[PDB]
Amino acid sequence: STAGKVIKCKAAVLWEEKKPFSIEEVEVAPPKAHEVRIKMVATGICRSDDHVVSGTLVTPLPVIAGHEAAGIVESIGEGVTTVRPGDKVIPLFTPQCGKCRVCKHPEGNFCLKNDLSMPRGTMQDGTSRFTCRGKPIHHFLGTSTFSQYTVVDEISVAKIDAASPLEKVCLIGCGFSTGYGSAVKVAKVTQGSTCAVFGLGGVGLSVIMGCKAAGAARIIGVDINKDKFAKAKEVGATECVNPQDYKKPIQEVLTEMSNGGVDFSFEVIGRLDTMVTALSCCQEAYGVSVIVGVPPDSQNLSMNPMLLLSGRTWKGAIFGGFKSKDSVPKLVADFMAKKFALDPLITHVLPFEKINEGFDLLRSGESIRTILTF
Ligand SMILES: [Zn+2]
Ligand SMILES: [Zn+2]
């Protein structure tokens, strides 16, 4: 089977709060008006995900998790100009409604049309295309990438590159154009600079990964993890510090190295400490620091007004600060084009079904990124 009539399929239900994954069987309707059913091929275990499995990210339950994947279209409502079958795709966790103050503004990618602001679990009509054979499961962001078939609107879906290794191009979804993009469309990084990177996993190497893009020269990468450095220097890292080495604030052993501090820095750790700790190790005249990741489960952070006044910039961005329908694609190509490769992020490739020994290697450290193959 294939269709214009509900489908077979075994999506995985997240039956409520840090209870593993129910690798159930479900019933997805055919794509309503203006929507697009996609037959997945691959997905990643982003942590953003973990946060629902955990109370941390509030979003309605039951819900199909996953937002980081690469599909192959398979049905398309009436109204859809933008995609057509057999077409490869990247579901988009950030809309692209091509018009709302942010969509029509030159730095506005958080489309006034997402679920992040207030998770509703639905679909843009306030309705959900998924039954638990008997109960309506809710949606996630607008992807619910964790099923073998999903229904995403059109504002939330991007056509990648016809011979795009659907395997690899999944990453271009969170992990990698979030890291890499901070470095590139946000902290407008400059040729020359000294760039610091706080966190040496999946998103930071993607971030260390776009500096070098941005322009160049010095990309220190701090990780108190003697292991994350190979890979580190492996993807563009000019050097590697471990805050454990030294008997002084790292905020200091950095200001040294740059001679008053790295030009640009980035916390891809999401720690409430390391966040104040890098507004800090940047030049106070003109230095700029962007907050990448941020646990939904958090206290503010303690902080000195005084780090902003010397004249320094604190930014932040969702989805590498990139406007997405218009970008996932430029971005593949560049992968296609050669520009940047994706493997050192890919530490694990698995039969989708071990979603949970999957979400394991995630929790007990061990792996950078991992592709749950469908
Ligand atoms: Zn994510
Ligand atoms: Zn918009």
Swiss-Prot record:
GO cellular component: cytosol
Reaction catalysis annotation: a primary alcohol + NAD(+) = an aldehyde + NADH + H(+); a secondary alcohol + NAD(+) = a ketone + NADH + H(+)
EC number(s) from the headed UniProt entry: 1.1.1.1
Annotated family: Belongs to the zinc-containing alcohol dehydrogenase family. Class-I subfamily.
Cofactor note: Binds 2 Zn(2+) ions per subunit.
Full protein name: Alcohol dehydrogenase E chain
Binding-site residues for Zn(2+) 2, renumbered to this chain: C97, C100, C103, C111
